[PDB]
Amino acid sequence: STGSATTTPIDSLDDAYITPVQIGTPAQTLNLDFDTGSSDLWVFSSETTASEVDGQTIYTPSKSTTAKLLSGATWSISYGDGSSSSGDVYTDTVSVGGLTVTGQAVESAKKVSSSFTEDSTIDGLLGLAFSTLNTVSPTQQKTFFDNAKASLDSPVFTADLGYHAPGTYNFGFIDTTAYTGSITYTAVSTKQGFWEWTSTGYAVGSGTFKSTSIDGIADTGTTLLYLPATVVSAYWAQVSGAKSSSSVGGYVFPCSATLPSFTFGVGSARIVIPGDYIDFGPISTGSSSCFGGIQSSAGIGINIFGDVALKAAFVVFNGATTPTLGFASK
Numbered sequence: 071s072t073g074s075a076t077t078t079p080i081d082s083l084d085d086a087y088i089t090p091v092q093i094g095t096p097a098q099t100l101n102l103d104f105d106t107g108s109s110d111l112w113v114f115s116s117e118t119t120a121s122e123v124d125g126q127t128i129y130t131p132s133k134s135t136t137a138k139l140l141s142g143a144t145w146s147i148s149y150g151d152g153s154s155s156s157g158d159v160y161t162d163t164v165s166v167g168g169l170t171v172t173g174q175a176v177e178s179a180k181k182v183s184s185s186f187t188e189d190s191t192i193d194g195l196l197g198l199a200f201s202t203l204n205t206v207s208p209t210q211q212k213t214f215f216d217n218a219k220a221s222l223d224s225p226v227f228t229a230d231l232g233y234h235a236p237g238t239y240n241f242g243f244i245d246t247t248a249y250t251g252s253i254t255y256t257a258v259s260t261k262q263g264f265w266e267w268t269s270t271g272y273a274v275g276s277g278t279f280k281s282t283s284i285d286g287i288a289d290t291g292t293t294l295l296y297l298p299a300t301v302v303s304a305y306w307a308q309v310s311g312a313k314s315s316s317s318v319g320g321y322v323f324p325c326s327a328t329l330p331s332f333t334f335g336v337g338s339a340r341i342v343i344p345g346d347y348i349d350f351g352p353i354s355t356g357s358s359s360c361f362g363g364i365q366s367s368a369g370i371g372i373n374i375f376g377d378v379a380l381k382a383a384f385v386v387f388n389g390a391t392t393p394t395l396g397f398a399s400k
């Protein structure tokens with residue numbers, strides 16, 4: 071089997087991407103944030119505290135002929151941005167872009183934090199990190215990918231995120247028309263449950279490439295690129311007037327600037343992030359200070375190759391017995 075689904079930016083900044091997902095019978099279509107940095111499939115639901123729902127589409131298990139309560143199971147998750155959600159669990163049929171899984175754990179939110187309520191465009195998350203991170207208790211559950219894997223033509227999924235444009239998530243096959251050149255594969259550590267890999271270095275603009283190992287995670291659920299403070303300082307020093315702002319909470323730059331590109335290494339290959347991709351626009355409406363898309367990881371404990379980096383590439387998440395990541399230009 072295979073599936074293929076279009077993923078669409080939620081706003082003009084590419085703050086996140088939503089992908090329609092069919093849940094239940096008859097289908098209930100919810101727009102979920104596919105997150106390679108977490109391992110829970112959770113949704114706004116008929117159980118979510120009513121004052122915490124503001125425009126989201128909800129899953130109603132009582133209207134699905136295939137829903138079953140997963141009796142006694144609960145879940146509770148906290149993300150790197152301080153957001154959280156929790157609830158109970160149903161099993162149901164879940165379809166992504168034609169690929170169907172029966173018996174998928176669908177985590178129904180009873181509570182969500184303010185950042186979820188305030189984002190009317192995201193109806194929940196679909197986690198694509200390793201199932202060791204799944205929060206369901208007392209019986210940990212599998213991700214959609216882990217449940218689909220044995221049925222897939224090839225045990226892979228690919229992320230092809232757009233810059234200010236739709237892109238694609240594919241399951242079970244690698245679309246050789248979707249990238250240029252060849253795919254460079256690199257080793258993955260699953261020790262922390264993430265798609266954790268080591269970049270071979272970086273360059274700023276037209277500058278020399280610096281060979282240095284940078285261990286980080288491929289995380290479709292994080293907007294920005296978070297790297298060590300040394301690397302980030304070296305980038306923003308090439309932008310006149312850029313500075314780290316403790317009042318704003320990261321690097322800002324004059325909106326009049328033209329940003330340099332940023333290159334990261336994948337083995338002997340190079341992925342170039344255009345300067346445009348690193349513009350996250352005014353800090354507040356009408357401001358002439360703009361927010362940078364490359365920020366320090368120093369106050370996180372891990373480097374994160376979020377959407378800023380991933381959308382410059384065609385990315386293969388290879389879930390074979392020995393997992394690997396692949397990157398190609400596009």
Ligand SMILES: OCc1cnc(N2CCOCC2)s1
Binds near residue numbers: 303304
């Ligand atoms: O505001 C505290 C700062 C820390 N690092 C800064 N930058 C300035 C621009 O060139 C790179 C480094 S400003």
Ligand code: NA
């Ligand atoms: Na922000």
